[PDB]
Ligand binder design. Structure first.
Ligand SMILES: CCOP(=O)(O)OCC
Ligand SMILES: [Co+2]
Ligand SMILES: [Fe+2]
Length: 328
């Protein structure tokens, strides 16, 4: 009975089960869902859509998602409690900062960031009492000077509390390596850290370099492909031109090289998206109507059929998430 915090309260680690470890109920901005609920039709329409989508993943075998929306992704922890109950799926919430932090965060020192993250982990997000169970952090290239601070503060808050840290990278620019240097300079154990979006590159030199050091490797955009959408300039920059299979192969690729224990797999999916072009979410829904059941329905059986054994895939979808989220 080691235990982790979800938006409905504590749970036993061993009940986390099949866990998608990089997901979003809604990709937004701080204060936005409350200032402009209609952007999304309504708070009510959004919740109902999350709920339908999560019951879908849940039918498919998913029991937990980790919602890595930070303050600046507009994390609404009330909405997460409310879809979590309605759909009967555990949702682990996040602290940390993504790459859209407002001036109130950007003016802060490493010491004050660390107080902010610890607050959300140890006391509760906002006035709610709901505790973040993962720390989210981000670079898009060389870490900006403020990003260095967030990363060091992320590492301190993790050593204090034992909550894992997880990251956004621009994977083509091999951010994970800097990211790891910064965390390591703070004494953080690589097995407390997941380097995310790593399925955005096919650079296995890069990926096995991280895995070999003990980092978890987040293969977390499985359904993101813009094949057949070549005249959709915003779809392209976001989805890329590699297929879902090409991504799913990375998983086998690491398993064949002995790195089964260092993989986490997810969709980086959402049910609403205000922080990009208008209607991106219709686009997304056409390219992947399965939303967050895409991994269990498409990716696992594809792995099974390329000869990956079931015990191995269990270790990836259950054991690794469990090892990772377990406060250490
Ligand atoms: C919250 C949305 O931000 P992102 O995860 O970087 O975007 C990928 C959909
Ligand atoms: Co991201
Ligand atoms: Fe994300």
């Amino acid at each position: 009975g080691d235990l982790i915090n979800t938006v409905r309260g504590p749970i036993p680690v061993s009940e986390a089960g099949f866990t998608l470890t990089h997901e979003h109920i809604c990709g937004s901005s701080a204060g936005f869902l409350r200032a402009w609920p209609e952007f999304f039709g309504s708070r009510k329409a959004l919740a109902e859509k999350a709920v339908r989508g999560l019951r879908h993943a849940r039918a498919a075998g998913v029991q937990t998602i980790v919602d890595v929306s930070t303050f600046d992704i507009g994390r609404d922890v009330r909405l997460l409690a409310e879809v979590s109950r309605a759909a009967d799926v555990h949702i682990v919430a996040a602290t940390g900062l993504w790459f859209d932090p407002p001036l109130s965060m950007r003016m802060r020192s490493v010491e004050e960031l660390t107080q902010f993250f610890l607050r959300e982990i140890q006391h509760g997000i906002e006035d709610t009492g709901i505790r973040a169970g993962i720390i989210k952090v981000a670079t898009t290239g060389k870490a900006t000077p403020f990003q260095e601070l967030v990363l060091k503060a992320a590492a301190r808050a993790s050593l204090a509390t034992g909550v894992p840290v997880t990251t956004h990278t621009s994977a083509s620019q091999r951010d994970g390596e800097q990211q790891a240097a910064i965390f390591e300079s703070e004494g953080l154990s690589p097995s407390r850290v997941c380097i995310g979006h790593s399925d955005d590159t096919d650079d296995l030199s890069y990926l096995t370099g991280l895995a070999a050091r003990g980092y978890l490797v987040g293969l977390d955009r499985m359904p993101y492909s813009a094949i057949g959408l070549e005249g959709d300039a915003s779809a392209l920059a976001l989805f890329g031109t590699r297929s879902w299979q090409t991504r799913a192969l990375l998983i086998k690729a690491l398993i064949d090289r002995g790195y089964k224990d260092r993989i986490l797999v997810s969709h980086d999916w959402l049910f609403g998206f205000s922080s990009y072009v208008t209607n991106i979410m219709d686009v997304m829904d056409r390219i992947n109507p399965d939303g967050m059941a895409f991994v269990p329905l498409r990716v696992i059986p594809f792995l099974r059929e390329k000869g990956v054994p079931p015990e191995t895939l269990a270790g990836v979808t259950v054991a690794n998430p469990a090892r990772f989220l377990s406060p250490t």
